[PDB]
């Protein structure tokens, strides 16, 4: 007698993400050599860390100009990988195909004024629960850090990851208007003959950014 | 590389005559027992038809790399869409034999019926051409019959051939034989 | 190694499964991420 | 319980080129002996290298006659395994069932004049991009090579393989009229009392010809 | 997950000669002993060699009488296992279920005359291509062999196997009237007071008879 | 051994596959074929 | 060895799979290709 098997029920359907592989039809193909082609990248987060990209501030420009009036806030935005200020950047373009994330997000601030213009800035991180700060004197109780312009232009501050739940979403449902993650505020303390200058910003992945649960959902 | 031409001695000068350097040339896709194993399709007859490897057309890939070898030996395979109870006699059975069930008979099972039958013939090796065009009766593999044969295919196994024969490409009217090629 | 999750070697040979590679004679962007300067650039207090 | 298997979906169809083998029905057959039958060939390119075959020049003859007029070009043709000058030869008959090729193609030139007739010829290879040469003085910047007739009749020159892409097609689509591979020109420098003689040509596979991707497509 | 298999297409049909075996239903049966039952035969050709059987000459008798007239030929017949002279014998009864054969076929000639009757006979083998001989003087260039009657009655001559093709058919199609195998002629040279005697013949398998390609085709 | 051509032992046991034989306490016609006299019976020249 | 690409020995025996060969007592055109003269026939300069 032949080896008897029992054809199980509810198995074998073509699941779009099955680990199986199909059976070949042609075989015996030797393709041209590709030894050491320049510029190969293996992981999609490796390129996110090594290459930062600009944000999208008011208007279309990626820079903020220095405020000479009584105001002190340059621009504050939500800490979400779907926020408007991060509309068109690699880190927020890649993180729409994944559901959850957990890690740090570096911010690179680069001052592009003349040689005879000086300024001083502050960036602070306000967690959820309280409305964001509106004055630098009321924001000095956060995880802020200040820098001064000079010979070295760029300063990079990496906002931390604080959350009750272990991982956080890369989306914002309409039911949640509270912005569960928080804010990140950027203030300008003072400036000297710095009228109409520019402070271009960038954004890069952190040293321990983690991105998971892939879902390709209606972008292209 | 001047050498006496009227000698039929092969002379293959290479690219290293003027500084060249021959890359490595590997030929797997052009073997003779790898290119013939591909289910060529033959024009099937009515109820009864014989398994002769020459009724395959002369312009296919198997039918045309076979009429390039004077002698050949190869086991066989078929896969037919019989509408009935197909049977198969060996080589030389009286043609009234393919009505009895003791001969190897496959029952209907949708859609095909794939068989692997041996090479049975008196001669040590068959031949494409024969200097007696009609070949003898002895040159075949057997005969199958069913109620209505619908499809038929040939797939030579262990093929090995001798004494090559000319191959002909299509003659174009223009200087070059242009045609379509797949393109996105 | 992609969505391949069986602990049994595939029934078909390697050369029939997929095109065999040929040699002559992530690689680079992962070397870039490790080169990243991270220490302090000034004198800490 | 029996060993339970799951009948997979989208498998098992009769692919015309599957590596599987059918199950037997008869068995136990001993065929007559074939020990050392004369003239067996294993590979189809082995016969292509050891046996050259003629070309198809103007008219039906495979030879070119010596030009006594102001002209110097005997016959120049495309370098394609579908060209007209190579219509009916083994190497171009075999290479219609395969899609791509990469290697050298030897040309054997054999002079069949009387004992008191002398001549001198040149063959040059012009790559794509420039129109082919029309005079020997304008073709001496190619990979040409000249030979002289004498005691040894035949001279064999093997045109090289130069191409950007690693492999090249064995066909010519109508969309590409540029003849992506190039030309091969054959000129006659001078001749002495060589009126109406003949220079039969041949063509053979190279030492490293490679032919791959088999497709039996509408010849027989 | 269960072990996934792919149910192949075009397999599993009930071929009448498959090597597989069915699965049991009853089991545990001990049959009575058969230790050393007399007369078992394993192969069907073993019985063909050890036991000869008669031919079928003119009329119904299996013997030929001695010709006293000017004629010298007793009876000549085709060398085919379908011939009429071998209509009803074991070796030709068994060889209708097989397609091809290759070997020797012994002939046993036994003289049954009185004590005072003497005779001398010849048997010769004529291959295909020439019409069979008609006189003993014209048949002495074959593979003939003569014997004389005396104390020992029986003489056995084994006609050889000569054929271009390695194996030969056990049938005779109507398209082939040439009798591709040949003839076997039996002549009587002389006789002394041997009027109306008898020479019974027999036929047996050879030492190296081979029979193959079984086909049960319309006898019972 | 008849039309049995698998290289795997059948799934079912031997006693369930077919009737087990019993002992007490081709065989003969093959002994006959070997006994066959074939040499010459007279003095060859 | 043709389009045979499984790493498991076929279920059926060798003699039942295909006709067993018999002996008595590419081969030649590959000997021809190696015999091919390729060196220069004259004195190079």
JSON list of C-alpha atoms in Angstrom, two decimals, chain A residues 38-165:
[
{"chain": "A", "resi": 38, "resn": "UNK", "atom": "CA", "xyz": [29.37, 51.17, -5.80]},
{"chain": "A", "resi": 39, "resn": "UNK", "atom": "CA", "xyz": [26.90, 52.34, -3.20]},
{"chain": "A", "resi": 40, "resn": "UNK", "atom": "CA", "xyz": [24.88, 49.33, -2.08]},
{"chain": "A", "resi": 41, "resn": "UNK", "atom": "CA", "xyz": [22.65, 49.75, 0.98]},
{"chain": "A", "resi": 42, "resn": "UNK", "atom": "CA", "xyz": [21.20, 46.76, 2.82]},
{"chain": "A", "resi": 43, "resn": "UNK", "atom": "CA", "xyz": [18.76, 48.24, 5.34]},
{"chain": "A", "resi": 44, "resn": "UNK", "atom": "CA", "xyz": [16.40, 51.14, 4.77]},
{"chain": "A", "resi": 45, "resn": "UNK", "atom": "CA", "xyz": [17.18, 52.73, 8.13]},
{"chain": "A", "resi": 46, "resn": "UNK", "atom": "CA", "xyz": [20.91, 52.83, 7.42]},
{"chain": "A", "resi": 47, "resn": "UNK", "atom": "CA", "xyz": [20.29, 55.47, 4.75]},
{"chain": "A", "resi": 48, "resn": "UNK", "atom": "CA", "xyz": [17.93, 57.31, 7.10]},
{"chain": "A", "resi": 49, "resn": "UNK", "atom": "CA", "xyz": [20.65, 57.79, 9.73]},
{"chain": "A", "resi": 50, "resn": "UNK", "atom": "CA", "xyz": [23.55, 58.68, 7.45]},
{"chain": "A", "resi": 51, "resn": "UNK", "atom": "CA", "xyz": [21.62, 61.24, 5.38]},
{"chain": "A", "resi": 52, "resn": "UNK", "atom": "CA", "xyz": [19.39, 63.93, 6.92]},
{"chain": "A", "resi": 53, "resn": "UNK", "atom": "CA", "xyz": [16.74, 65.84, 5.01]},
{"chain": "A", "resi": 54, "resn": "UNK", "atom": "CA", "xyz": [14.97, 69.17, 5.39]},
{"chain": "A", "resi": 55, "resn": "UNK", "atom": "CA", "xyz": [11.69, 69.97, 7.10]},
{"chain": "A", "resi": 56, "resn": "UNK", "atom": "CA", "xyz": [8.78, 71.99, 5.72]},
{"chain": "A", "resi": 57, "resn": "UNK", "atom": "CA", "xyz": [8.20, 75.19, 7.66]},
{"chain": "A", "resi": 58, "resn": "UNK", "atom": "CA", "xyz": [5.64, 77.89, 6.89]},
{"chain": "A", "resi": 59, "resn": "UNK", "atom": "CA", "xyz": [5.31, 78.67, 3.23]},
{"chain": "A", "resi": 60, "resn": "UNK", "atom": "CA", "xyz": [7.56, 76.29, 1.34]},
{"chain": "A", "resi": 61, "resn": "UNK", "atom": "CA", "xyz": [11.03, 77.17, 2.64]},
{"chain": "A", "resi": 62, "resn": "UNK", "atom": "CA", "xyz": [12.82, 74.80, 5.07]},
{"chain": "A", "resi": 63, "resn": "UNK", "atom": "CA", "xyz": [14.31, 77.63, 7.18]},
{"chain": "A", "resi": 64, "resn": "UNK", "atom": "CA", "xyz": [12.97, 79.94, 9.89]},
{"chain": "A", "resi": 65, "resn": "UNK", "atom": "CA", "xyz": [13.85, 83.63, 9.98]},
{"chain": "A", "resi": 66, "resn": "UNK", "atom": "CA", "xyz": [14.81, 85.50, 13.13]},
{"chain": "A", "resi": 67, "resn": "UNK", "atom": "CA", "xyz": [11.96, 87.24, 14.95]},
{"chain": "A", "resi": 68, "resn": "UNK", "atom": "CA", "xyz": [12.80, 90.83, 15.88]},
{"chain": "A", "resi": 69, "resn": "UNK", "atom": "CA", "xyz": [9.46, 91.57, 17.57]},
{"chain": "A", "resi": 70, "resn": "UNK", "atom": "CA", "xyz": [8.19, 90.90, 21.09]},
{"chain": "A", "resi": 71, "resn": "UNK", "atom": "CA", "xyz": [7.54, 87.27, 20.14]},
{"chain": "A", "resi": 72, "resn": "UNK", "atom": "CA", "xyz": [10.19, 84.68, 20.98]},
{"chain": "A", "resi": 73, "resn": "UNK", "atom": "CA", "xyz": [8.82, 81.43, 19.52]},
{"chain": "A", "resi": 74, "resn": "UNK", "atom": "CA", "xyz": [10.12, 80.52, 16.07]},
{"chain": "A", "resi": 75, "resn": "UNK", "atom": "CA", "xyz": [7.99, 77.45, 15.33]},
{"chain": "A", "resi": 76, "resn": "UNK", "atom": "CA", "xyz": [6.65, 74.62, 17.48]},
{"chain": "A", "resi": 77, "resn": "UNK", "atom": "CA", "xyz": [5.16, 71.44, 16.03]},
{"chain": "A", "resi": 78, "resn": "UNK", "atom": "CA", "xyz": [3.77, 68.09, 17.08]},
{"chain": "A", "resi": 79, "resn": "UNK", "atom": "CA", "xyz": [6.08, 65.15, 17.73]},
{"chain": "A", "resi": 80, "resn": "UNK", "atom": "CA", "xyz": [4.54, 62.77, 15.22]},
{"chain": "A", "resi": 81, "resn": "UNK", "atom": "CA", "xyz": [5.93, 61.18, 12.10]},
{"chain": "A", "resi": 82, "resn": "UNK", "atom": "CA", "xyz": [2.77, 62.38, 10.33]},
{"chain": "A", "resi": 83, "resn": "UNK", "atom": "CA", "xyz": [3.02, 66.04, 11.35]},
{"chain": "A", "resi": 84, "resn": "UNK", "atom": "CA", "xyz": [2.88, 68.77, 8.73]},
{"chain": "A", "resi": 85, "resn": "UNK", "atom": "CA", "xyz": [6.32, 70.19, 9.52]},
{"chain": "A", "resi": 86, "resn": "UNK", "atom": "CA", "xyz": [7.68, 66.74, 8.64]},
{"chain": "A", "resi": 87, "resn": "UNK", "atom": "CA", "xyz": [5.44, 66.26, 5.59]},
{"chain": "A", "resi": 88, "resn": "UNK", "atom": "CA", "xyz": [8.14, 65.67, 2.96]},
{"chain": "A", "resi": 89, "resn": "UNK", "atom": "CA", "xyz": [11.24, 64.14, 4.51]},
{"chain": "A", "resi": 90, "resn": "UNK", "atom": "CA", "xyz": [12.79, 60.70, 4.20]},
{"chain": "A", "resi": 91, "resn": "UNK", "atom": "CA", "xyz": [12.18, 59.65, 7.81]},
{"chain": "A", "resi": 92, "resn": "UNK", "atom": "CA", "xyz": [8.49, 60.53, 7.57]},
{"chain": "A", "resi": 93, "resn": "UNK", "atom": "CA", "xyz": [8.19, 59.20, 4.04]},
{"chain": "A", "resi": 94, "resn": "UNK", "atom": "CA", "xyz": [9.55, 55.79, 5.05]},
{"chain": "A", "resi": 95, "resn": "UNK", "atom": "CA", "xyz": [7.52, 55.65, 8.28]},
{"chain": "A", "resi": 96, "resn": "UNK", "atom": "CA", "xyz": [4.14, 55.71, 6.54]},
{"chain": "A", "resi": 97, "resn": "UNK", "atom": "CA", "xyz": [4.52, 52.09, 5.39]},
{"chain": "A", "resi": 98, "resn": "UNK", "atom": "CA", "xyz": [5.05, 50.91, 8.98]},
{"chain": "A", "resi": 99, "resn": "UNK", "atom": "CA", "xyz": [2.55, 51.07, 11.81]},
{"chain": "A", "resi": 100, "resn": "UNK", "atom": "CA", "xyz": [4.62, 51.62, 14.96]},
{"chain": "A", "resi": 101, "resn": "UNK", "atom": "CA", "xyz": [7.97, 53.12, 15.94]},
{"chain": "A", "resi": 102, "resn": "UNK", "atom": "CA", "xyz": [10.12, 53.56, 19.04]},
{"chain": "A", "resi": 103, "resn": "UNK", "atom": "CA", "xyz": [13.30, 55.58, 19.30]},
{"chain": "A", "resi": 104, "resn": "UNK", "atom": "CA", "xyz": [15.02, 58.94, 19.09]},
{"chain": "A", "resi": 105, "resn": "UNK", "atom": "CA", "xyz": [14.83, 61.50, 16.26]},
{"chain": "A", "resi": 106, "resn": "UNK", "atom": "CA", "xyz": [17.78, 63.84, 15.84]},
{"chain": "A", "resi": 107, "resn": "UNK", "atom": "CA", "xyz": [17.31, 67.46, 14.77]},
{"chain": "A", "resi": 108, "resn": "UNK", "atom": "CA", "xyz": [20.15, 69.33, 13.05]},
{"chain": "A", "resi": 109, "resn": "UNK", "atom": "CA", "xyz": [20.05, 73.13, 13.29]},
{"chain": "A", "resi": 110, "resn": "UNK", "atom": "CA", "xyz": [22.36, 75.07, 10.97]},
{"chain": "A", "resi": 111, "resn": "UNK", "atom": "CA", "xyz": [22.81, 78.85, 11.11]},
{"chain": "A", "resi": 112, "resn": "UNK", "atom": "CA", "xyz": [23.47, 80.65, 7.81]},
{"chain": "A", "resi": 113, "resn": "UNK", "atom": "CA", "xyz": [23.92, 84.30, 8.74]},
{"chain": "A", "resi": 114, "resn": "UNK", "atom": "CA", "xyz": [26.70, 86.73, 7.92]},
{"chain": "A", "resi": 115, "resn": "UNK", "atom": "CA", "xyz": [29.98, 86.90, 9.78]},
{"chain": "A", "resi": 116, "resn": "UNK", "atom": "CA", "xyz": [28.84, 89.89, 11.86]},
{"chain": "A", "resi": 117, "resn": "UNK", "atom": "CA", "xyz": [25.50, 88.47, 13.04]},
{"chain": "A", "resi": 118, "resn": "UNK", "atom": "CA", "xyz": [25.08, 86.54, 16.29]},
{"chain": "A", "resi": 119, "resn": "UNK", "atom": "CA", "xyz": [22.17, 84.72, 17.88]},
{"chain": "A", "resi": 120, "resn": "UNK", "atom": "CA", "xyz": [21.20, 82.28, 20.62]},
{"chain": "A", "resi": 121, "resn": "UNK", "atom": "CA", "xyz": [18.46, 79.65, 20.47]},
{"chain": "A", "resi": 122, "resn": "UNK", "atom": "CA", "xyz": [16.70, 77.09, 22.67]},
{"chain": "A", "resi": 123, "resn": "UNK", "atom": "CA", "xyz": [14.82, 73.88, 21.90]},
{"chain": "A", "resi": 124, "resn": "UNK", "atom": "CA", "xyz": [12.64, 72.18, 24.53]},
{"chain": "A", "resi": 125, "resn": "UNK", "atom": "CA", "xyz": [10.49, 69.05, 24.64]},
{"chain": "A", "resi": 126, "resn": "UNK", "atom": "CA", "xyz": [7.05, 69.20, 26.28]},
{"chain": "A", "resi": 127, "resn": "UNK", "atom": "CA", "xyz": [5.31, 65.90, 27.04]},
{"chain": "A", "resi": 128, "resn": "UNK", "atom": "CA", "xyz": [1.55, 65.27, 26.83]},
{"chain": "A", "resi": 129, "resn": "UNK", "atom": "CA", "xyz": [-0.87, 66.44, 29.49]},
{"chain": "A", "resi": 130, "resn": "UNK", "atom": "CA", "xyz": [-0.10, 70.17, 29.62]},
{"chain": "A", "resi": 131, "resn": "UNK", "atom": "CA", "xyz": [-0.56, 72.65, 26.80]},
{"chain": "A", "resi": 132, "resn": "UNK", "atom": "CA", "xyz": [2.75, 73.52, 25.15]},
{"chain": "A", "resi": 133, "resn": "UNK", "atom": "CA", "xyz": [4.80, 76.40, 26.54]},
{"chain": "A", "resi": 134, "resn": "UNK", "atom": "CA", "xyz": [4.53, 79.86, 25.00]},
{"chain": "A", "resi": 135, "resn": "UNK", "atom": "CA", "xyz": [7.48, 81.72, 26.57]},
{"chain": "A", "resi": 136, "resn": "UNK", "atom": "CA", "xyz": [11.09, 80.62, 27.09]},
{"chain": "A", "resi": 137, "resn": "UNK", "atom": "CA", "xyz": [10.93, 81.47, 30.79]},
{"chain": "A", "resi": 138, "resn": "UNK", "atom": "CA", "xyz": [8.01, 79.05, 31.14]},
{"chain": "A", "resi": 139, "resn": "UNK", "atom": "CA", "xyz": [9.72, 76.31, 29.09]},
{"chain": "A", "resi": 140, "resn": "UNK", "atom": "CA", "xyz": [12.99, 76.03, 31.03]},
{"chain": "A", "resi": 141, "resn": "UNK", "atom": "CA", "xyz": [11.56, 73.17, 33.12]},
{"chain": "A", "resi": 142, "resn": "UNK", "atom": "CA", "xyz": [11.55, 70.77, 30.15]},
{"chain": "A", "resi": 143, "resn": "UNK", "atom": "CA", "xyz": [14.45, 68.76, 28.70]},
{"chain": "A", "resi": 144, "resn": "UNK", "atom": "CA", "xyz": [15.62, 71.90, 26.87]},
{"chain": "A", "resi": 145, "resn": "UNK", "atom": "CA", "xyz": [19.16, 72.70, 25.71]},
{"chain": "A", "resi": 146, "resn": "UNK", "atom": "CA", "xyz": [20.59, 75.97, 24.39]},
{"chain": "A", "resi": 147, "resn": "UNK", "atom": "CA", "xyz": [23.33, 76.66, 21.85]},
{"chain": "A", "resi": 148, "resn": "UNK", "atom": "CA", "xyz": [25.22, 79.69, 20.59]},
{"chain": "A", "resi": 149, "resn": "UNK", "atom": "CA", "xyz": [26.32, 80.54, 17.06]},
{"chain": "A", "resi": 150, "resn": "UNK", "atom": "CA", "xyz": [29.99, 80.91, 16.21]},
{"chain": "A", "resi": 151, "resn": "UNK", "atom": "CA", "xyz": [32.79, 79.16, 14.33]},
{"chain": "A", "resi": 152, "resn": "UNK", "atom": "CA", "xyz": [30.97, 75.80, 14.21]},
{"chain": "A", "resi": 153, "resn": "UNK", "atom": "CA", "xyz": [27.62, 76.36, 12.52]},
{"chain": "A", "resi": 154, "resn": "UNK", "atom": "CA", "xyz": [25.53, 73.21, 13.05]},
{"chain": "A", "resi": 155, "resn": "UNK", "atom": "CA", "xyz": [24.15, 71.94, 16.38]},
{"chain": "A", "resi": 156, "resn": "UNK", "atom": "CA", "xyz": [22.27, 68.63, 16.66]},
{"chain": "A", "resi": 157, "resn": "UNK", "atom": "CA", "xyz": [19.85, 67.89, 19.51]},
{"chain": "A", "resi": 158, "resn": "UNK", "atom": "CA", "xyz": [18.19, 64.48, 19.72]},
{"chain": "A", "resi": 159, "resn": "UNK", "atom": "CA", "xyz": [14.74, 64.61, 21.31]},
{"chain": "A", "resi": 160, "resn": "UNK", "atom": "CA", "xyz": [14.20, 61.59, 23.60]},
{"chain": "A", "resi": 161, "resn": "UNK", "atom": "CA", "xyz": [11.57, 58.88, 23.53]},
{"chain": "A", "resi": 162, "resn": "UNK", "atom": "CA", "xyz": [9.17, 59.00, 26.48]},
{"chain": "A", "resi": 163, "resn": "UNK", "atom": "CA", "xyz": [5.96, 57.00, 26.40]},
{"chain": "A", "resi": 164, "resn": "UNK", "atom": "CA", "xyz": [3.87, 54.85, 28.70]},
{"chain": "A", "resi": 165, "resn": "UNK", "atom": "CA", "xyz": [3.23, 52.21, 26.04]}
]
